């Protein structure tokens, strides 16, 4: 059901391995589909469905715009450093924007952060920017005084962003709307029982531990759901139990790919 389009922009004053001076990543339903950085200087596909569906003009325009954004982000690091009276050093500037389509309604956001703390965010309902502190109030004033900044962002988030998200979902439908069943294995140590689900899609899942059919919530440990390299996901749940109550315990897995919850034993 729900879909999202998001762009993540990261600029750093001190690059390091794995961390270019500037990177932009676009994601649809949480999966990266395009990436640009200051070293390749090209917007590049990271999934097949995007290449097979847009023209070379898409790549050229995205590459030109990203080359322009690189410069802006370089300037914004400088401005932020001076607003906070900071010496040269290691700093980060990040911005994220995007839209969600759910049921009939639309959500959109645009927000930036400096050294990992909020700086400024759009309030799309009031067409104002919310400033985290005095430094960010100067930016609030600049963007609100310009007279068109919040309105252009409102337009992009509610219109342009949603229009592209619909096109993306349509291009990727076979990937994005597929269902892949979890492959589940139960293990145990010294007794710690572990129910691990491998390779499911989409990411929502519910793994519960039952003692003779009884949902043991308060005693269930759970990881964060995490991706595999092929765009499928992984999740686990453990239970700390007394050695040799073993027969009693079953793992239940609820997932869209499974018409009925799966039940698994050690």
């Amino acid at each position: 059901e729900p879909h999202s389009l998001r762009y993540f922009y990261t600029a750093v004053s001190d690059p390091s391995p794995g961390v270019p001076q500037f990177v932009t990543v676009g994601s649809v339903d949480g999966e990266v589909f395009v990436r640009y950085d200051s070293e390749t200087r090209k917007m590049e596909p990271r999934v097949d469905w995007i290449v097979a569906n847009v023209d070379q003009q898409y790549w050229d325009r995205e590459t030109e715009t990203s080359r322009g954004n690189e410069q802006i982000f370089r300037v914004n690091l400088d401005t932020a450093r001076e607003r906070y009276n900071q010496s040269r050093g290691s700093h980060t500037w990040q911005c994220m924007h995007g839209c969600d389509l759910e049921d009939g309604s639309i959500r959109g956001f645009q927000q930036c952060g400096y050294d990992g703390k909020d700086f400024i965010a759009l309030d799309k309902d009031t067409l104002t920017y919310t400033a985290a502190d005095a430094a960010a109030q100067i930016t609030k004033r600049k963007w609100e005084q310009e007279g068109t900044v919040a309105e252009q962002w409102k337009n992009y988030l509610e219109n342009t962003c949603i229009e592209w998200l619909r096109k993306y979902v349509s291009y990727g439908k076979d990937v994005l709307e597929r269902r892949e069943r979890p492959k589940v294995r139960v293990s145990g140590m010294e007794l710690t029982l572990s129910c691990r689900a491998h390779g499911f899609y989409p990411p929502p899942i519910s793994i519960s531990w039952l003692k003779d059919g009884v949902v043991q919530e308060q005693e269930t440990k759970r990881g964060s759901t995490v991706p595999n390299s092929d765009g499928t996901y992984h999740a686990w749940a453990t239970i700390d139990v007394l050695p040799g109550n073993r027969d009693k315990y079953q793992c239940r897995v609820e997932h869209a790919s499974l018409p009925q919850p799966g039940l698994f034993s050690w």
């Binding site: 762009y7 922009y9 932009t24 676009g26 917007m43 898409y58 995205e62 715009t65 990203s66 322009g68 954004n69 802006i72 982000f73 300037v75 914004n76 401005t79 932020a80 911005c95 930036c112 700086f119 400024i120 930016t139 600049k142 963007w143 900044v149 252009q152 962002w153 992009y156 342009t160 962003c161 592209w164």
Partner: peptide, 7 residues
């Protein structure tokens, strides 16, 4: 598709 302003 990826508005980006100076702060």
């Amino acid at each position: 598709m990826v508005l980006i302003r100076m702060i």
